Amino acid sequence: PQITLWQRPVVTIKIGGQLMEALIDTGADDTVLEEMDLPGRWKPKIIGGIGGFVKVRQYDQIPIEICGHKVIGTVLVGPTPTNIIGRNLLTQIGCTLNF
Amino acid sequence: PQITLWQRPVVTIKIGGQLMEALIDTGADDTVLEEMDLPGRWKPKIIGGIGGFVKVRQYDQIPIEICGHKVIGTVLVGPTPTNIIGRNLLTQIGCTLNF
Numbered sequence: 001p002q003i004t005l006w007q008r009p010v011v012t013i014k015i016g017g018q019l020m021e022a023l024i025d026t027g028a029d030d031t032v033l034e035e036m037d038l039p040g041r042w043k044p045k046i047i048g049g050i051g052g053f054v055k056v057r058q059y060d061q062i063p064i065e066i067c068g069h070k071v072i073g074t075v076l077v078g079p080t081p082t083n084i085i086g087r088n089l090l091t092q093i094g095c096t097l098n099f
Numbered sequence: 100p101q102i103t104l105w106q107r108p109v110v111t112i113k114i115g116g117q118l119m120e121a122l123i124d125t126g127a128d129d130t131v132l133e134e135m136d137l138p139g140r141w142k143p144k145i146i147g148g149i150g151g152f153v154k155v156r157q158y159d160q161i162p163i164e165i166c167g168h169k170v171i172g173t174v175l176v177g178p179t180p181t182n183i184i185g186r187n188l189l190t191q192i193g194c195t196l197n198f
């Protein structure tokens with residue numbers, strides 16, 4: 001589709017059988033999701049945003065369905081207000097930026 | 100142009116006659132530039148992101164230029180490693196996400 005930027009570009013993704021909202025973030029390199037206990041072994045990473053550095057749990061080779069498109073990648077899980085999907089999963093669905 | 104997300108989306112902008120580089124960030128409501136002086140007056144503003152809140156300086160009506168298109172808008176200034184082009188200015192140049 002052709003999504004405009006007058007509002008926050010939110011889409012629906014599917015993580016382990018649960019449907020949730022997420023933000024298309026081209027400034028985020030990675031995908032940071034909310035608090036959930038995902039199946040698998042995690043390892044800590046400390047990422048840094050606009051208001052500080054956060055301690056997230058890194059999960060590898062996790063299956064995500066972004067709008068019916070089953071893709072795969074790394075998802076960091078930590079204390080974030082909104083689910084955010086970054087450039088790592090976006091390239092997988094072919095998402096571009098036009099103007 | 101069409102821009103993909105394999106490498107981070109950086110464009111060459113002109114603010115104050117000097118050429119800078121900035122990140123087209125659709126996950127950012129506002130536009131935040133690196134600490135500098137802009138030839139307008141400013142008021143304080145508290146924005147929030149990953150980690151927490153931070154205090155920035157809100158300058159209004161600054162004449163920026165993103166890839167040929169000359170825009171005028173609200174630009175924030177604060178502590179950041181990268182210049183960020185938020186949705187307020189992106190809607191002004193017609194940016195859209197396509198997939």
Ligand SMILES: CC(C)(C)NC(=O)[C@@H]1CN(Cc2cccnc2)CCN1C[C@@H](O)C[C@@H](Cc1ccccc1)C(=O)N[C@H]1c2ccccc2C[C@H]1O
Binds near residue numbers: 030
């Ligand atoms: C992977 C990770 C998430 C840690 N990366 C970032 O947060 C980057 C960091 N860089 C580089 C960087 C900058 C400073 C320190 N470390 C790294 C600058 C840009 N942020 C990208 C932003 O797009 C992230 C969003 C996330 C968000 C959106 C809505 C709700 C909460 C959080 C962001 O912070 N946007 C906020 C935002 C941003 C600008 C202006 C106003 C606002 C309000 C909101 O839109």
